[PDB]
Design an enzyme around this catalytic site. Sequence first.
Site, PDB file in Angstrom:
ATOM      1  N   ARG A 190       0.831  -1.198   0.000  1.00  0.00           N
ATOM      2  CA  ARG A 190       0.000   0.000   0.000  1.00  0.00           C
ATOM      3  C   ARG A 190       0.864   1.246   0.000  1.00  0.00           C
ATOM      4  NH1 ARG A 190      -1.720   1.927   4.125  1.00  0.00           N
ATOM      5  NH2 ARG A 190      -1.080   0.231   5.525  1.00  0.00           N
ATOM      6  N   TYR A 225      -0.639  -4.648  -6.153  1.00  0.00           N
ATOM      7  CA  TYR A 225      -0.371  -5.159  -4.817  1.00  0.00           C
ATOM      8  C   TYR A 225      -1.490  -4.991  -3.805  1.00  0.00           C
ATOM      9  CZ  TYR A 225       2.720  -7.057  -1.317  1.00  0.00           C
ATOM     10  OH  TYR A 225       3.332  -7.911  -0.420  1.00  0.00           O
ATOM     11  N   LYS A 247      -9.316  -2.950   1.863  1.00  0.00           N
ATOM     12  CA  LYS A 247      -9.161  -1.662   2.512  1.00  0.00           C
ATOM     13  C   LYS A 247     -10.066  -0.600   1.895  1.00  0.00           C
ATOM     14  CE  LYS A 247      -5.862  -3.200   5.137  1.00  0.00           C
ATOM     15  NZ  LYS A 247      -6.144  -3.381   6.576  1.00  0.00           N
ATOM     16  N   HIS A 302     -10.462  -1.325  11.532  1.00  0.00           N
ATOM     17  CA  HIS A 302      -9.254  -2.082  11.323  1.00  0.00           C
ATOM     18  C   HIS A 302      -9.009  -2.922  12.588  1.00  0.00           C
ATOM     19  CE1 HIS A 302      -4.701  -1.894  10.052  1.00  0.00           C
ATOM     20  NE2 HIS A 302      -5.299  -2.985   9.598  1.00  0.00           N
ATOM     21  N   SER A 346      -0.950  -1.555  11.159  1.00  0.00           N
ATOM     22  CA  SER A 346      -0.359  -2.542  10.295  1.00  0.00           C
ATOM     23  C   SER A 346       0.996  -2.966  10.849  1.00  0.00           C
ATOM     24  CB  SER A 346      -0.242  -1.954   8.891  1.00  0.00           C
ATOM     25  OG  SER A 346      -1.362  -1.114   8.622  1.00  0.00           O
ATOM     26  N   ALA A 347       1.297  -4.260  10.771  1.00  0.00           N
ATOM     27  CA  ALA A 347       2.561  -4.810  11.274  1.00  0.00           C
ATOM     28  C   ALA A 347       2.761  -4.711  12.791  1.00  0.00           C
ATOM     29  CB  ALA A 347       3.744  -4.182  10.545  1.00  0.00           C
ATOM     30  N   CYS A 348       1.665  -4.675  13.554  1.00  0.00           N
ATOM     31  CA  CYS A 348       1.753  -4.559  15.025  1.00  0.00           C
ATOM     32  C   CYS A 348       1.071  -5.703  15.784  1.00  0.00           C
ATOM     33  CB  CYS A 348       1.188  -3.214  15.474  1.00  0.00           C
ATOM     34  SG  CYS A 348       2.184  -1.822  14.901  1.00  0.00           S
ATOM     35  N   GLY A 349       0.639  -6.745  15.067  1.00  0.00           N
ATOM     36  CA  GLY A 349       0.296  -8.019  15.708  1.00  0.00           C
ATOM     37  C   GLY A 349      -1.138  -8.500  15.701  1.00  0.00           C
ATOM     38  N   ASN A 391      -1.204 -12.266  14.683  1.00  0.00           N
ATOM     39  CA  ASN A 391      -0.641 -13.097  15.750  1.00  0.00           C
ATOM     40  C   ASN A 391      -1.591 -13.245  16.930  1.00  0.00           C
ATOM     41  OD1 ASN A 391       2.044 -11.539  14.585  1.00  0.00           O
ATOM     42  ND2 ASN A 391       2.354 -13.727  14.988  1.00  0.00           N
ATOM     43  N   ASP A 443      -8.348  -8.679  10.541  1.00  0.00           N
ATOM     44  CA  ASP A 443      -8.013  -7.371   9.943  1.00  0.00           C
ATOM     45  C   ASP A 443      -9.125  -6.321   9.940  1.00  0.00           C
ATOM     46  OD1 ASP A 443      -5.734  -5.934   8.527  1.00  0.00           O
ATOM     47  OD2 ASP A 443      -7.175  -5.764   6.934  1.00  0.00           O
ATOM     48  N   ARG A 470       3.658 -11.380   1.797  1.00  0.00           N
ATOM     49  CA  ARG A 470       2.347 -11.737   2.297  1.00  0.00           C
ATOM     50  C   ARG A 470       1.963 -13.137   1.909  1.00  0.00           C
ATOM     51  NH1 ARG A 470      -0.728  -7.997   5.653  1.00  0.00           N
ATOM     52  NH2 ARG A 470       0.563  -6.100   5.494  1.00  0.00           N
ATOM     53  N   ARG A 490       3.209  -0.179  18.700  1.00  0.00           N
ATOM     54  CA  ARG A 490       4.610  -0.349  19.101  1.00  0.00           C
ATOM     55  C   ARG A 490       5.092   0.850  19.899  1.00  0.00           C
ATOM     56  NH1 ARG A 490       7.690  -4.193  16.238  1.00  0.00           N
ATOM     57  NH2 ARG A 490       6.374  -5.357  14.764  1.00  0.00           N
ATOM     58  N   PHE A 546       3.400 -12.861  22.038  1.00  0.00           N
ATOM     59  CA  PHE A 546       2.791 -13.951  21.286  1.00  0.00           C
ATOM     60  C   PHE A 546       1.843 -14.740  22.193  1.00  0.00           C
ATOM     61  CE2 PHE A 546       6.917 -12.815  19.529  1.00  0.00           C
ATOM     62  CZ  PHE A 546       6.553 -12.421  18.258  1.00  0.00           C
ATOM     63  N   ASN A 600       0.696 -13.531  25.518  1.00  0.00           N
ATOM     64  CA  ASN A 600      -0.307 -12.480  25.608  1.00  0.00           C
ATOM     65  C   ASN A 600      -1.661 -13.028  26.112  1.00  0.00           C
ATOM     66  OD1 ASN A 600       1.615 -10.610  24.732  1.00  0.00           O
ATOM     67  ND2 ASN A 600       0.965 -10.750  22.600  1.00  0.00           N
TER      68      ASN A 600
HETATM   69  N1  LIG Z   1       7.674  -8.609  20.415  1.00  0.00           N
HETATM   70  C1  LIG Z   1       6.471  -9.011  19.898  1.00  0.00           C
HETATM   71  N2  LIG Z   1       6.294  -8.898  18.572  1.00  0.00           N
HETATM   72  C2  LIG Z   1       5.123  -9.272  17.999  1.00  0.00           C
HETATM   73  C3  LIG Z   1       4.032  -9.807  18.815  1.00  0.00           C
HETATM   74  N3  LIG Z   1       3.001 -10.080  18.002  1.00  0.00           N
HETATM   75  C4  LIG Z   1       3.395  -9.762  16.755  1.00  0.00           C
HETATM   76  N4  LIG Z   1       4.660  -9.293  16.767  1.00  0.00           N
HETATM   77  C5  LIG Z   1       5.410  -8.817  15.598  1.00  0.00           C
HETATM   78  O1  LIG Z   1       4.524  -8.164  14.669  1.00  0.00           O
HETATM   79  C6  LIG Z   1       4.945  -8.466  13.340  1.00  0.00           C
HETATM   80  C7  LIG Z   1       3.821  -9.176  12.615  1.00  0.00           C
HETATM   81  O2  LIG Z   1       2.630  -8.390  12.737  1.00  0.00           O
HETATM   82  P1  LIG Z   1       1.219  -8.781  12.018  1.00  0.00           P
HETATM   83  O3  LIG Z   1       0.294  -9.601  12.894  1.00  0.00           O
HETATM   84  O4  LIG Z   1       1.615  -9.317  10.664  1.00  0.00           O
HETATM   85  O5  LIG Z   1       0.523  -7.315  11.907  1.00  0.00           O
HETATM   86  P2  LIG Z   1      -1.004  -7.046  11.500  1.00  0.00           P
HETATM   87  O6  LIG Z   1      -1.612  -6.126  12.555  1.00  0.00           O
HETATM   88  O7  LIG Z   1      -1.689  -8.370  11.313  1.00  0.00           O
HETATM   89  O8  LIG Z   1      -0.742  -6.233  10.126  1.00  0.00           O
HETATM   90  P3  LIG Z   1      -1.755  -6.083   8.839  1.00  0.00           P
HETATM   91  O9  LIG Z   1      -2.119  -7.491   8.456  1.00  0.00           O
HETATM   92  O10 LIG Z   1      -0.832  -5.444   7.854  1.00  0.00           O
HETATM   93  O11 LIG Z   1      -2.871  -5.218   9.346  1.00  0.00           O
HETATM   94  C8  LIG Z   1       6.222  -9.285  13.489  1.00  0.00           C
HETATM   95  O12 LIG Z   1       7.334  -8.370  13.544  1.00  0.00           O
HETATM   96  C9  LIG Z   1       6.080  -9.944  14.840  1.00  0.00           C
HETATM   97  O13 LIG Z   1       7.322 -10.293  15.467  1.00  0.00           O
HETATM   98  C10 LIG Z   1       4.291  -9.898  20.243  1.00  0.00           C
HETATM   99  O14 LIG Z   1       3.382 -10.326  20.987  1.00  0.00           O
HETATM  100  N5  LIG Z   1       5.492  -9.497  20.698  1.00  0.00           N
HETATM  101  O1  LIG Z   2      -1.548  -2.664   5.550  1.00  0.00           O
HETATM  102  C1  LIG Z   2      -2.406  -3.345   6.149  1.00  0.00           C
HETATM  103  O2  LIG Z   2      -2.926  -2.967   7.229  1.00  0.00           O
HETATM  104  C2  LIG Z   2      -2.854  -4.603   5.578  1.00  0.00           C
HETATM  105  O3  LIG Z   2      -3.654  -5.263   6.257  1.00  0.00           O
HETATM  106  C3  LIG Z   2      -2.290  -5.080   4.241  1.00  0.00           C
HETATM  107  S1  LIG Z   2      -2.897  -4.388   2.831  1.00  0.00           S
HETATM  108  O4  LIG Z   2      -4.146  -5.108   2.618  1.00  0.00           O
HETATM  109  O5  LIG Z   2      -3.161  -2.982   2.968  1.00  0.00           O
HETATM  110  O6  LIG Z   2      -1.932  -4.575   1.551  1.00  0.00           O
HETATM  111 MN   LIG Z   3      -2.561  -9.128   9.452  1.00  0.00          MN
HETATM  112 MN   LIG Z   4      -4.459  -4.372   8.012  1.00  0.00          MN
END
Ligand SMILES: Nc1nc2c(ncn2[C@@H]2O[C@H](COP(=O)(O)OP(=O)(O)OP(=O)(O)O)[C@@H](O)[C@H]2O)c(=O)[nH]1
Ligand SMILES: O=C(O)C(=O)CS(=O)(=O)O
Ligand SMILES: [Mn+2]
Ligand SMILES: [Mn+2]
Length: 608
Positions: free
Chosen positions: A85, A233, A242, A262, A284-287, A290, A309, A400, A431, A516, A519
């Site tokens: 994005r 992409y 989105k 979101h 995004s990328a904050c867990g 997981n 999501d 992805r 974060r 992880f 939590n």
């Molecule tokens: N230290 C730590 N890192 C975490 C934890 N959970 C996830 N991460 C980190 O978060 C990243 C993966 O995040 P995702 O779950 O892919 O993020 P998302 O919110 O699903 O992102 P989008 O799908 O893009 O919305 C990796 O760097 C993991 O190591 C946690 O509980 N502790």
């Molecule tokens: O960026 C995000 O928060 C996503 O979930 C991936 S994307 O669908 O925007 O490419």
């Molecule tokens: Mn995700």
């Molecule tokens: Mn997302």
Amino acid sequence: PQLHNGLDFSAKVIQGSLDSLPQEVRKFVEGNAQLCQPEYIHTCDGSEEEYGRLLAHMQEEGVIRKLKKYDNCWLALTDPRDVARIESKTVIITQEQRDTVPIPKSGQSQLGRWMSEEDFEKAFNARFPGCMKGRTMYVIPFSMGPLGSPLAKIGIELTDSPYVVASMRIMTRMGTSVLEALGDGEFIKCLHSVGCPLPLKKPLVNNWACNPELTLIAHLPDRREIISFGSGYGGNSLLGKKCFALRIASRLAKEEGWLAEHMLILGITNPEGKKKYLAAAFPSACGKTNLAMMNPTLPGWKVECVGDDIAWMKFDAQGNLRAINPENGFFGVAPGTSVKTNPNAIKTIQKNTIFTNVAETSDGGVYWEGIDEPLAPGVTITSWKNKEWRPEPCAHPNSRFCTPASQCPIIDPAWESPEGVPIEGIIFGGRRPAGVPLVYEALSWQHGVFVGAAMRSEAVIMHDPFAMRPFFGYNFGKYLAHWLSMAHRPAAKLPKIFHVNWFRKDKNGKFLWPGFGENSRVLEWMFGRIEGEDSAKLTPIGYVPKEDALNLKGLGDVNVEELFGISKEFWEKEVEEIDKYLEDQVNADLPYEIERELRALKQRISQM
Ligand SMILES: Nc1nc2c(ncn2[C@@H]2O[C@H](COP(=O)(O)OP(=O)(O)OP(=O)(O)O)[C@@H](O)[C@H]2O)c(=O)[nH]1
Ligand SMILES: O=C(O)C(=O)CS(=O)(=O)O
Ligand SMILES: [Mn+2]
Ligand SMILES: [Mn+2]
Ligand SMILES: [Mn+2]
Ligand code: NA
């Protein structure tokens, strides 16, 4: 009827029949065929045979490779310019700017990117005329939400990319049954092109059609149109996700009295078999992923995934907040996924899954940073750049997987229930390496809305209110007022609001908390607090767990005074940053109640 052949595209239809389309769908298809000049028109039926045929076609064209290690899995490698994005090239069009973003006080808005209709017409005309010359325009009829759900909405995406068709089959409910459910109903108009008409004016990198220079992802909520050009992409091209389920839907939700967020949605069950649903907004990328598919460490506890999501939520006649996941799949970050960080994802993605920009092993499997698995002696690796690779990351950091939700071994039995799942708690977080405690609980609905609005997250610590910074379909000030209005609803059962931080660090720069699966120990505290347990201590930022309220057994050196410590100095700075942000960015549209919460937090901090 007409004077020549004219605007009848029947002769170019290679699957389906224009005559059988609902009339407004027909007009949408034919009008854009006239504009974009595709060579063929393929109306998607969503069948296994079509999907089969399309994967084979992409393989024949060198657009994807089959991953021989797994069952029906595929790898796409992109132009390194088209990997994510792009917020800067993403815009919303309204007559009035203020409908889309608050008018900032001093600076440039970071709450959206408004574009005038006139600037967009110029941009549109500089891009789409003739843009599909020599390609197939695919017509993708798709449902966001289960095919009957009262919260569900239908879109038609036109695209010239078979990779988008395939990914939309996984990420949405797609095909003929959707056209049949649509009838003469309203639908969202989604127009997508990679922007590379044939013959190619420019050389293709890794057989991945894109136009980085002209990339533009546009939303026109009043025409109920999404128009995207130049990127193939994820969030740029899969318009249901989105663009539709967050940007357009958030504006529809504001108008009709619901929410589009979101947020993951998870079911959590305690060792007694008592179960609650929770939603969580992290950036995004904050867990989210997981958390949503967590394998809990605490004995007897179970986590099930409703979605990872996007959440569509609405108060029902009984006052419960009901949530559905409008997606059909998980479009999850690959790197960092491993058997110990997300074992359930590992189990899901071994069949019928499309991977984008990960590495490939010589035995036909996948690889990425943080996969945490030895390869057998002899196995070698091709990186996402199609180059031999040894220990440059082998996988793009935003690479992805795209995988069916129904395959997840912990998918929730109610993940497709039309009525949705009842939400008893909403979790915010991001974060924060410093200062922000592991977990705290809001003082009230209004404080909780402030807590969402005040969200920040390391990319530099960015602001990302409700994790929706890149996704607001309208004025964020009005979005806040809309959230606050949920407390005026009669009989509304307002969920408890929490904020978490998995990412606090020590002076040495390493994580204070294991995270992880661990939590689950934090979710247990939230579960108890929803039940009304006297397990909370009042602080200036909200309620935190009492001493010995959290199950910390077995971790074992967890510095609780550092994890839960609240520094006057840090919070004095924090409120200053929140204040400057809200004043500049929301300005005249900031609701009184949010300013009041700011003032109240500032006051409580000053009394430390
Ligand atoms: N230290 C730590 N890192 C975490 C934890 N959970 C996830 N991460 C980190 O978060 C990243 C993966 O995040 P995702 O779950 O892919 O993020 P998302 O919110 O699903 O992102 P989008 O799908 O893009 O919305 C990796 O760097 C993991 O190591 C946690 O509980 N502790
Ligand atoms: O960026 C995000 O928060 C996503 O979930 C991936 S994307 O669908 O925007 O490419
Ligand atoms: Mn995700
Ligand atoms: Mn997302
Ligand atoms: Mn060919
Ligand atoms: Na490729």
